[PDB]
């Protein structure tokens, strides 16, 4: 009858969003995926509630870029043919890009299924 929560630390990963460099992480409550542009002392420019995330995709290993793509629920007044909102983050750590992507992906998938 035991219940366990995830206990891996929250990563802060070097990532590019809409061609600007920044940091992808989660809020301390693990409810929001947040991206903040460098220097990273301002507020996030992307804040995605894990409750609104509907898919998580990745470039396959050996691709030119390491990218995670998060899809969000359609916005309330979107037209029915419109694509859903999406957010692509390219991992730019020179050696650890794919490792960091995997770590975020794993943490996110665990949280998404836990909720
Ligand atoms: Cl959003
Ligand atoms: Cl949900
Ligand atoms: Cl790769
Ligand atoms: Cl609608
Ligand atoms: Cl996995
Ligand atoms: Cl769930
Ligand atoms: Cs890191
Ligand atoms: Cs969700
Ligand atoms: Cs889903
Ligand atoms: Cs790569
Ligand atoms: Cs809609
Ligand atoms: Cs976007
Ligand atoms: Cs970098
Ligand atoms: Cs659950």
Number of other CB atoms surrounding residue 16 within 10 Å = 19
| Cα radius of gyration rounded to whole Å, the chain | 15
Q: Give the closest ligand to the alpha carbon of residue 60.
A: 3
Annotated resolution, angstroms: 1.8
Q: Give the closest ligand to the alpha carbon of residue 21.
A: 13
- The distance from CA 57 to its chain's CA centroid, rounded to whole angstroms, is 10
Q: Give the closest ligand to the alpha carbon of residue 56.
A: 9
Give the number of residues written for the chain: 115
User: How many angstroms is it from 74 CA to the middle of ligand 4?
Assistant: 8
In the chain, where are the structural domains located? 13-114
Which CATH architecture group holds 13-114?
Roll (2.30)
User: How many angstroms is it from 85 CA to the middle of ligand 11?
Assistant: 11
55: left (phi over 0), alpha (psi -120 to 50) or beta: beta
């Amino acid at each position: 009858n035991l219940y366990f929560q995830g206990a891996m630390s929250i990563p802060r990963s070097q990532t590019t969003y809409k061609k600007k460099e920044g940091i992808l992480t989660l809020t301390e409550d693990r409810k929001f995926l947040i991206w903040t542009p460098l220097p990273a002392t301002g507020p996030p420019t992307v804040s995605l509630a894990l409750d609104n995330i509907t898919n998580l995709q990745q470039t396959p290993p050996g691709s030119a870029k390491v990218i995670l793509k998060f899809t969000e629920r359609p916005r309330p007044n979107a037209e029915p043919g419109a694509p859903p909102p999406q957010y692509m983050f390219q991992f730019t750590h020179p050696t650890d890009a794919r490792a960091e992507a995997n770590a975020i992906r794993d943490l996110l998938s665990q949280l998404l299924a836990a909720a």
